[PDB]
Amino acid sequence: KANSEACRDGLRAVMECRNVTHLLQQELTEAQKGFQDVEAQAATCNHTVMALMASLDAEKAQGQKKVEELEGEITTLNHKLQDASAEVERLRRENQVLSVRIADK
Amino acid sequence: ANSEACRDGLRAVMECRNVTHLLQQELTEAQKGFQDVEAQAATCNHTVMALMASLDAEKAQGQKKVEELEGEITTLNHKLQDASAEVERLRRENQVLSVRIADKK
Amino acid sequence: ANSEACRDGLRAVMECRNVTHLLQQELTEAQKGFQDVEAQAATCNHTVMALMASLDAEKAQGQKKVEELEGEITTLNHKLQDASAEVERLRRENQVLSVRIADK
Amino acid sequence: SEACRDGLRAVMECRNVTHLLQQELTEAQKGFQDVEAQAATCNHTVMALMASLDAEKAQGQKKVEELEGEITTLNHKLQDASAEVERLRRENQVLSVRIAD
Known part of the structure; x- marks a missing residue:
């Protein structure tokens, strides 16, 4: 009688749990986007740093020769x-x- | 240790993903749980109703004889x-x- | 820009942390779910054993009488x-x- | 009542599993902080050089x-x-x- 009723609530809590892992799943994908953009960003920053020093050196050399x-x-x-x-x-x-x-x- | 922080961050993120699949499995099993308990209750209530039926009979058949x-x-x-x-x-x-x-005589 | 990917990544992580707390609570409600049901089954299981005794007790008199x-x-x-x-x-x-x- | 037992067992298991999730999430939080720290080491470095270059022009075009x-x-x-x-x-x-x- 109130056995269907407890089961029901039971099932509700399970159902809340399912929906919730749903968000969980997606926010994880954003966390993944985050690190991937950070990798991209640091890569660009490598690029920039070898070029920076190089640029400086070039400028110096020029100024000297001139x-x-x-x-x-x-x-x-x-x-x-x-x-x-x-x-x-x-x-x-x-x-x-x-x-x-x-x-x- | 350049990319090693992005990496470790990325693995954690994946591990989360593997762990939450496992959750989904275990919730599916909890859900089975409640579905089945309803099954069993139905069965038990039948048993109860039948047992009382067959008591009533006995009483009637009995006081009849x-x-x-x-x-x-x-x-x-x-x-x-x-x-x-x-x-x-x-x-x-x-x-x-x-x-x-x-x-x- | 650098700060943004971190900012957004980290927020995501925190939102997940957040949402796991919610899971735990609901799990506890599920747990309550099953403990209730177990009680009820215990009861039903006693009620049952009782009738299976009466029935037999009843047979034993009927039989005898x-x-x-x-x-x-x-x-x-x-x-x-x-x-x-x-x-x-x-x-x-x-x-x-x-x-x-x-x-x- | 095998169903309770089994259901109860699955419940306990989600609980165990969800705590593992929590630890791995803490480990992701760690990643993001270690990375932010380096984006700083790194931005700084870059910044220092641009500055070093610009100051070189100020020595150069004045000399x-x-x-x-x-x-x-x-x-x-x-x-x-x-x-x-x-x-x-x-x-x-x-x-x-x-x-x-």
Whole structure:
């Protein structure tokens, strides 16, 4: 009489359990998505890190090769200037002689 | 140990999946459980109802035979009273004829 | 982005943890389910054994009582014959003596 | 009443099984935390390098143009001092010819 009734409740609790493992199953699939995206993300991050260092190195090399070029320029000009100041001195001193010789005759 | 954290996370997730299948199996079995208990109750209630039936019968069949046999005792008593009376009748009658033979000579 | 996959993954895990607690509760209700049913079966099982005893007890009286009276019947039957016998004896004597009187 | 017993047994078993689920879920929770920890080690690292690069540009484009504003600043000196050579040369040749006269 109230044996059908207890069985019933019994079956209800079992049925709640079934539905519930149902959500469980799916949320597990999301947990799986999570780790898989994390793997994808870390992979990209590997990619990025070998490329980062490489990029830095490249930049450095470039800057360097384009610096020892520039300071070869700087000294070259210092020389030329050193020389043109020399010509200037040669010419000042020489001109005086010529003008003194001119007063003399 | 790069991917080893993603991995271990992934295995756990799978293990959960295997464990919850096992759950589904064991709930199916709990469900069998309740279905069958209802089966058995039905059976038991039948047994109960049948046992009482066959008690009632016994009581009726029983008190029926008693009355049939108490009846028959009755008639047999009467018949013995009739026969016994008849025996005492013929004893008296006898003695009276015996005497008429003695008082004859 | 990094933080999001963790965030979302972890939430999932927690939701499952959550939902297992619910399972345990309902399992306990199932357990209650069966213990109730067991009680009821115990009862029904006692009720049963009782009738199987009465029935037998009832058979044992019926059996016996009937036997009683059926014996009472037989002894009356014999007594009935004995008296029907003794009668015979006497109708015999009667006719015989009554003739002797007729003669004389 | 075999059904109770068996039913009861299955129930107990779900209970056992569900606790195993709980342990494995705790172990998944662990995964996600270990991973988050590394995404941090990792983001940090990357971040540090971008920063290291950018600072290299700030050394680079400041050094270069500190030394190119040294080029042209010597160049102007060259142009001007060698304008003085052309002055003095023409003027030497003038004077030389006033001599020979």
